[PDB]
């Protein structure tokens, strides 16, 4: 299993503009288009992102291209972030995937907001950190996905996804 397959499981793939769990306009593999209520603002952003007149729809190829860009940007973001980089560097390969997953869903800023949990991960206090991560809006809003990520940090294996 790898970051791409993990994220493809968590986000799904949709080839027509859709609304995410928060109600925002998204397309592909969790690619947020805009937080704006306008489907028109969304269709404009989409065309700008793809470089063609899409009319709210894209091909598999376009979805994957967007996905490659987003995972890349998430990774580069972590490495440039002063709060995030040290944590990332301290982790093993599977757990690194869990942090990337959080960053892709919630942005750098958002994850950087989990101060206490980050400190516990850096310390390698797995169980403690899993309990702390669960005390967030994130966990209450998307509990099954949060649980999968949480189990990933807790165990350092892909068991939560080997099911799926």
Strand bridging mode 25-28 / 14-19 = antiparallel
Name the DSSP class of 158: S
- What is the number of other CB atoms lying within 10 angstroms of the CB of residue 127? 9
- Technique used: X-ray
What resolution in angstroms, rounded to 1 decimal? 1.9
Sheet with 25-28, edge to edge strand ranges: 14-19, 25-28, 31-34
Cα dihedral 54/73/99/79 (nearest 10): -170
H helical segments located in 12-142: 39-50, 60-80, 85-90, 93-112, 115-122, 126-133, 137-141
Contacts for 125 with CB less than 8 Å, ≥ 6 apart: none
46 is in an annotated binding site: no
Binding residue per annotation — 79? no
Q: Which domains does the chain have, with CATH numbers?
A: 1-164 (1.10.530.40)
**Residues taking part in catalysis:** 11, 20
């Amino acid at each position: 299993m790898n970051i791409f397959e993990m994220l493809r499981i968590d986000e799904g793939l949709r080839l027509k503009i859709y609304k995410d769990t928060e109600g925002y306009y998204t397309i592909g593999i969790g690619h947020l288009l805009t937080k704006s209520p306008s489907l028109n603002a969304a269709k404009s952003e989409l065309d700008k992102a793809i470089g063609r007149n899409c009319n709210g729809v894209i091909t598999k190829d376009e979805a994957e291209k967007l996905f490659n860009q987003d995972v890349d940007a998430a990774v580069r973001g972590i490495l440039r972030n002063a709060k995030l980089k040290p944590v990332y560097d301290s982790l093993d390969a599977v757990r690194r995937c869990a942090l990337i997953n959080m960053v892709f869903q919630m942005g750098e800023t958002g994850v950087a907001g989990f101060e206490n949990s980050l400190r516990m991960l850096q310390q390698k206090r797995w169980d403690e950190a899993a309990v702390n991560l669960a005390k967030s809006r994130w966990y209450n809003q998307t509990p099954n996905r949060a649980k999968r990520v949480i189990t990933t940090f807790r165990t350092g294996t892909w068991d939560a996804y080997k099911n799926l």
